Amino acid sequence: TQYGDITPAKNSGSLVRVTSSATAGTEVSGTVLFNVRNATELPWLSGQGSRYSKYRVRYAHFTWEPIVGSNTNGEVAMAMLYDVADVTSITIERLMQTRGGTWGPIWSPTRKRLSYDPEHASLPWYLSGVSSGAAAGNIQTPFQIAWAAQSSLVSTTLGRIMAEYLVELTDPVDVTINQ
Amino acid sequence: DITPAKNSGSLVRVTSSATAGTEVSGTVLFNVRNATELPWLSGQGSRYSKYRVRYAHFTWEPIVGSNTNGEVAMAMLYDVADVTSITIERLMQTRGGTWGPIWSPTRKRLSYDPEHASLPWYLSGVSSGAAAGNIQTPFQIAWAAQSSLVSTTLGRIMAEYLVELTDPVDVTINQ
Amino acid sequence: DITPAKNSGSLVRVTSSATAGTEVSGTVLFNVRNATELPWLSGQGSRYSKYRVRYAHFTWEPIVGSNTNGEVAMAMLYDVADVTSITIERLMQTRGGTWGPIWSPTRKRLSYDPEHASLPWYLSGVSSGAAAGNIQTPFQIAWAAQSSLVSTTLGRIMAEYLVELTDPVDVTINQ
Amino acid sequence: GQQPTRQVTPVSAPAAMGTQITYRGPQVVTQYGDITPAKNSGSLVRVTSSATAGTEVSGTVLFNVRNATELPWLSGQGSRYSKYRVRYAHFTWEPIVGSNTNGEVAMAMLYDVADVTSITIERLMQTRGGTWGPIWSPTRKRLSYDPEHASLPWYLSGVSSGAAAGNIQTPFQIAWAAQSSLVSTTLGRIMAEYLVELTDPVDVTINQ
Amino acid sequence: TQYGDITPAKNSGSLVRVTSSATAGTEVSGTVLFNVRNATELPWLSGQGSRYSKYRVRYAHFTWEPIVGSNTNGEVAMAMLYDVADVTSITIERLMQTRGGTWGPIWSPTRKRLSYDPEHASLPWYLSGVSSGAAAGNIQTPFQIAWAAQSSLVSTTLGRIMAEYLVELTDPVDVTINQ
Amino acid sequence: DITPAKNSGSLVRVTSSATAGTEVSGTVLFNVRNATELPWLSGQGSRYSKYRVRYAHFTWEPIVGSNTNGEVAMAMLYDVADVTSITIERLMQTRGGTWGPIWSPTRKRLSYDPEHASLPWYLSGVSSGAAAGNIQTPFQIAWAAQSSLVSTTLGRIMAEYLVELTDPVDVTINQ
């Protein structure tokens, strides 16, 4: 197969901004879908997912980016999920029991990054689509990043979750038709 | 253990718009259980659990004279969901886009790219729904055409394929 | 570190002159940020600082019947400044000139010559001006056509390319 | 028996992190060809907090042999040569604040003298060269120039006003953005070590 | 790439006629752009620049051609510039400090010729154009020849500046469109 | 020391006879100083003393629809003197004869045979006379055409060449 058939998208960026609960010390959870179509958290990537039919993730590393001082009193955790249907009960003690679970103090930048395991992809090429539904979801997104944090600080942004990746897109499509 | 089904056939017959010059668009699902456009193949799909496409080539087949005006276009889609907003200009910027005058037999052909199958073996099923559809259909052919003629049949979209089927199943159960 | 964007698309749609037999000319800038004629590509150009063209092939796409009179012509220009005095006879004596009856799909194609790029990597920018333009655009397609028909759309100018982009940039900043 | 179940890593933060820097002097040498390598280092920008707490502050720097504002030393060299090119250039963040402080910083590379608006942290993070981190800590990964992708084999030592003229005289720019709970306080500086090759001498008076 | 794609233009010719100031002993300056489009000083070359899109200079040597006797009292100087914007303050003492600067007595034909340095070209292929402006200028012309002379003689032509070159043109264009 | 000038262009535009079906004939001198049909080249010929043709290919370029009647023909002549009695039937029995329906782009092309140049290097001159002409022109293209249409322009005769020039000369002197 010739050159060009696969287009690599290598870049990084802020996945999400993690901000504390309005009630001091209350865990805050979240789940982020890794898509070429998640325009909210993967803008740069989304602008391309939209113009290609299929895609696959070559590699993706996630890390915690703190933006609060050393005296802050919080904790953070991340793990990788592979079922779009898994969206509840995201607690810290649970992420610490699921694949890649990384926990640490709020002020500390992640040392041992969390990474995608491609050799276990549920399928060769995922679809650049938006069809709602659990099944449809798992066929359009390879994995998700579950996270949970907590802090005595009230309604303050603690930091972000960074992502350094490289994904390959294939089969160009018209932005409009492709939706 | 793996059976190859090699054949060809007419997928669809394209008819001019009621309003001259206006575009007519469409989309065809490529699978072993598409009785409407891939009849011959359906007789096979009906008796095997899984399958995958080895190769598939699509072309334009004219019925009109070289004088007729208008043009055709085709491209490949890989999502049962996308079936709207199809137009020549758009198909032209889509994977595999072929085109040309309506009276002329397509030069370059539209071919399937197995290297990027979303999955090794697709299901010979008929379940409804977007997902259920993407699991049963490797791809679809999007097409659009327009002609100065009115409500006349311009031509057909042709298909030449080789499909590998596997895991035989009683036709009645498999549905 | 270098991303290839391979695709095709319709650049322009050429329409007959108000005065039959009279020539209609035009010029298309080839770059990653040309939303008008290279839409699909623009979505890429918008998110990369630099780029360069690996290969690009242009052709004539007829919409009219083989009976129609007139002819088309294309050539490559390498200066955003030159946009006047374009005529068939002239394009024919310009680098890469292709031509032929209006109803006929171009035989030989117009191809890009990277061996002579004015520079290694062009900027994905939108600044106005001749210079700023030559720094952002590797070349343009000049075309001219004439037909016995009146104010009718003759055909489209097609493009097939492979572009290598580099140095990603946030879409908002890059403008 | 089996392998470990987890991996523990001790982490710690000091009251304040920083860096002392002693200037050793610029390095210049004439060589065969017309080539003459200029090597130097220093402060690029003095990054100071927004008057409105928590608000983002930003900006960009042109890498020029004739940018008397931020690269004064380099200007002296630029004024005497006609052309040049960058061998390497690395930029880095240096904190003046205690680890107690809140905020973050980020920087990346741009290649069009015209792109100088809408600079923000979240946006620099998705731009090539993106580096970032809590404001109080020196930047681990540095920002380096990529000369293999230069648009010009040799850039010009000129000062013409255009946007194009600017891109013909500048190989790249440093975008940066930061925010902090502190108000109108100088957060830190962006340092730079680089090496450029000047060529084709010219009387300074004329080179303008 | 095949034969013919690049057309070599090898020749020489008079660049400029250097004539003295109306006021005895006053330095006279000048700048000459090396273009396939400078019809005033590079006629032979210009007639081709006009019919090609791009071009590059393989080599170019400049020399002083005196046409006044040994008893004449003057001096001449040349140097090479690479910024079209550099056009003022052209004095002899300054050319003698810029690249290739050659100075000598008026009656004496240049011995050590001044030459273009291609390995330092700002760009691979220059444009055969005329768009005014500094930037546009530097993209259409690779370099210029700055010169200055002076002599007790009044308003008399001292000599010429010769040029022996070889430039390669590429991408034919219609003479009219190309402007 | 030897410069190659590679390009193409329109030589002549052929127009139908006043009397339908009647033949229209013509002949084009191929040289570096033919401002009328080889303009671009003239700008080169004007500044070189000698030259020789590396390769030259001529073709028919239609402007009419596939319905139009009539035919075209071309052949190569090697004597400035011969310009009379040109007719299709005759060109067909002459070296390099190409032909075909008027609306159809020539299949086989007319090519120059350098192996038999009457001389190594031809002069870039403009002197009048048969001899003076044969010394300055390596060959000419004879053509003839006829069509059912009346006084309409049928098409153009195209040329693609590579010419080697030598011994530069000031344009003014060289004439």
From TrEMBL, chains A, E:
GO molecular function: structural molecule activity
Key word Ribosomal protein present: no
Keyword set, alphabetical order: Capsid protein, T=3 icosahedral capsid protein, Virion
Keyword tRNA processing listed: no
Predominant localisation class: virion
Signal peptide: none
Icosahedral viral capsid protein S domain: residues covered: 1-173
GO cellular component: T=3 icosahedral viral capsid
Subcellular location: Virion
Coiled coil feature spans: none
Family as reported in the entry's similarity comment: Belongs to the icosahedral plant coat protein family.
Protein known as: Capsid protein
Organism name: Ryegrass mottle virus
Gene name, Swiss-Prot/TrEMBL: ORF4
Residues of the full protein shown: 57 to 235 of 235
From TrEMBL, chains B, C, F:
Record localization: Virion
GO cellular component: T=3 icosahedral viral capsid
Highest taxon in the source lineage: Viruses
GO molecular function, one term: structural molecule activity
Name of protein: Capsid protein
Family: Belongs to the icosahedral plant coat protein family.
Domain Icosahedral viral capsid protein S intervals: 1-169
Keyword annotations: Capsid protein, T=3 icosahedral capsid protein, Virion
Gene: ORF4
